[PDB]
């Protein structure tokens, strides 16, 4: 889900400039949820903008943001020419995991048929059912089935029973969050408090951007406890200021790089155009707009696949020295010694991040000599897996906010384990709450299906492995072999990408099929699992990864001349076994596409369709063997008329149940 | 693939009776699959059996054993009424590997046109190329494309180049196997050693049954290294009469006798003058042991298939797995196979479960309760991947090897891997005498009876119960877990009846089979205790029905796989009354929200989901760590019924190995 609001204080914006800013803000957040969208602004058509803050307009529609962008326009009642010197507008895109994605369930929610309070919510209220029964007895009627409505009907209940005629908007919000259980990130707007916004969070991201040609009064807003000129963030001499409430930084970087990341239970409030926190640090974002632009590519996913030569380099930058063959991960310098005195490695993650652990488990066992266990976070929690004080627990999360991975982290901390975060998001929950960690530095990933995040996690775990064995004489040559492979890896990725057209041709032979089996073993078990997940996610074909050594134990019965099959046969120590699996598939009349090495002349002669990738070190080959399956999934989706950036039935980053 | 030889020594039998015994032996071996079979026996129609011992007749044929039986009785020049006081007949079912199926490539393979030596073989001789060249240079002409023929030609080469006129049959075979490379189980017969048999193995099972109305000299045959006298071999004491049964599978012996000797690698067993001795290149020996197997356990009975039988008899097989091991009278568990090792096991620091296929799913199905009751780390490994990674293993690891057959290559090699590293090894098997039961430090026989069906049904649930019982032993000294143990054991007490209740819903499962009759895919979703149920159900439907069924961990839906859900994709969800109930409901709402209309396997009394879901399979409630047994049976039946509807033979393997090398 996504939150975005635009508060222009004494910065004249017409009603069109504001709506185009709310839509443009949701477009930056659409990848977090694109089942429905909505906006909330001030209505009325009075030239004097002051006589219009008493009328709230809600435009909510089902579909992506482009369905709302057109619903907002071509309306017969809203005059898009009213100049507003002061105005507040809130927007939201929703990931409808439950129920229908109807406009009544989309945000902003309302508290009554006159819109006295409207709120946009990211998260879940674990006791909204109790709140719903309490509010219905006092005289409040509910319309939607969402848990967000109990937040709107309640902020109005605290307003209908206040003690003084002018209780601050903060006091009303403070009484609400005290009755809310679970996680949430809220942004309120009310007719009674014109132009005033309130932003509180608890277990969900919520920052506040600021732009102004004037100087700011401070760069460290002091948190308060239940507000003068030496307490609020505001322009000194004049009033020109623009705020940008948002649950992510991509929606704000386009307008300014000065945000204030709030914290749990911090109740920010903009009053008279002054930002004050109740119960901070105005900082510069380290992100360029180009990082969240498609560039010359037709889709984010295509960009992020073809940029893997660069993102791999950025992952190793300032960490790998090829002249002296040294590896240093600054994020682990103060813990690497204690990590080596531990007795077991546990990798915990979901989805593609889990596959990155599968892809590096073998080399981690080799170079650390420690037991390495790889766990799906959801199952890890269901079983109450035993964890001990001398366990090192890794948490792989591109977003750093995945619910199951994050709860596994707090589970392992409670048991005294040493926790390490492998993240792609600075300041994320998982990067903060782990004892140490590594930022893979692959750049923002906008496509729902992770591509560069996987290969960057892969490389990051390999670098950790190289550190763990940098004091073993017997492993020096093995380290050199691996590091030379890493030096040559960016160019070999480029070689794989040059086969883009050859992959597209094979896709034309498969897009009509209902199923495909992807078979691999050893280092390429993860490859066939990740490839199967990608084809599932964006093409909707029934693709499944099958461990090659397991074919003879049942799954081989599903192979015939009609069943599409992709096999991975690389020149490592399992080559002979992979050839036996291939012979078994052929005996069953299978006609598989084989991903193999360029020099594998035997395989290339005896197989019609082969994807010939260049050879790398065995423990790095998984990076090269997965890219063709990334490309294949992309082309299959295009052939089937689907969107590769917005696959049906989900969005990016699972931050709730 | 199947070996059977019958040696009657001073037990008069007619040629008819001998041939009927050989055929009946192969009938017990057909379930393993084969493309041809043959028999070898003494020819000639001289009324005195002693003169016919120099004429070996062969009857081999491509096809089913029934056709072979017709060919036997269809011999105008063969008199079936000659009585043999002493005779050795051998029989074999072949699964072609080298040389296409044909009469010439069938067993027994002969050493020359006069059949001086014949041999039946299970396995593959790797260096059969080199051996063939050598024997051709010495003047031996080959007539078949089988690797086996090199064995028959080589034993005649040793005979033709023997130093003394009275070199033993054993010595010849010893010299043969010392030149062979690979895996083999062999039985030899020769006109130069009438009435004698020699059996040997390396990497393939071979056993010997024995029957005599007279007392036997011993129940422990001592090994002889390179004097064969009355104190060193097996034989009837006061009289000569005795019968021997060589076989690669006890199923071909059990109807005649339950006293068997399991040979080990490089053993050379020989019957000379009706006396069985075991040669080899305190005092080691081979035990004559009693099998508790019965012929009825390998017969369909009133069922139309072995798959149907082994599914529907699971109330009985679960009871057999628990017999003598669970005392509901005082809530105690005793696995006799672990008595001398339970103490060490409790001092170890990690459990590793290693297996392939459905046996691996048995580990996944019990991982959680093992973690709970042992409080140790529990790692579940697919044997093939375990080997590829050179997984770290330590002296204080307890490694379990789950295998119905006890012979699966990758599982067995994982066992030997762990032994080299000093780990305590434990075998969970269903085949007495198998490699994994022998080479583990200790083990548990799950005692589900032989599994004749192609797919693992009762073996899975019996493994499930066996691992739960082990878990109950590991926590029997913990006060805080007494209640939890009682709850689980009362569940085991009620489990056989709860299985019958599930089996009584067979009609409801058929209705579901007709709904999926035309479908090409089905997603089976679950989590926690029922993750294994999804994986095992998906494997069954793949293996038996040949449709693309896949098990999906419910917690992973929102991470990608949920994109497959729409109004067309068939889905089966498992929602039971355990601690993951709310999370499973969430997954159900996620599926429905995307136009999915799934079939739900749920508890009988889950009124909410039964009303909000059209088709529900309503199983009875049990302990959470036992529900997996009840929720998997409907998927076993589903796979069975779908295959029947689509005209498939559920007792037909299909899953064949690599093609036949024609050379
Ligand atoms: N990338 C998606 C699959 O293409 C999804 O599986 C993703 O990996 C999963 O949601 C985990 O997200 P995270 O890396 O941010 O924790
Ligand atoms: N029987 C099959 C399951 O349907 C197969 O997966 C089997 O479980 C696997 O081959 C392992 O065999 P094992 O139990 O004899 O070791
Ligand atoms: N390799 C031998 C025996 C195979 C077997 O039946 O096990 C053959 O193909 O004839």
Author numbering:
A (entry chain B): 2 to 227, 241 to 293, 304 to 681
B (entry chain A): 2 to 227, 240 to 294, 300 to 681
Text of the article:
In the first step of the HP, GFAT synthesizes d-glucosamine-6-phosphate (GlcN6P) from l-glutamine (l-Gln) and Frc6P, releasing l-glutamate (l-Glu). GFAT contains two domains: the glutaminase domain responsible for releasing ammonia in the hydrolysis of l-Gln to l-Glu and the isomerase/transferase domain, which catalyzes both the isomerization of Frc6P to d-glucose-6-phosphate (Glc6P) as well as the transfer of ammonia to Glc6P to produce GlcN6P. The active sites of the two domains are linked by an ammonia channel, which forms when GFAT engages with both of its substrates, l-Gln and Frc6P. The main distinctive feature between prokaryotic and eukaryotic GFAT is the feedback inhibition by the HP product UDP-GlcNAc, which inhibits the glutaminase function.
We wondered how the presence of l-Glu and GlcN6P would affect the structure and co-crystallized GFAT-1 in the presence of both product molecules. The GlcN6P-bound structure formed the same asymmetric dimer as the Glc6P-bound structure and a linear sugar was present in the active site. Compared to human GFAT-1, the GlcN6P-bound E. coli structure shows the pyranose ring GlcN6P in the active site and no electron density for the glutaminase domain is observed, although the full-length protein was crystallized. While in the E. coli structure the product might have already left the active site, destabilizing the glutaminase domain, our structure represents the last step of catalysis, just before departure of the GlcN6P product.
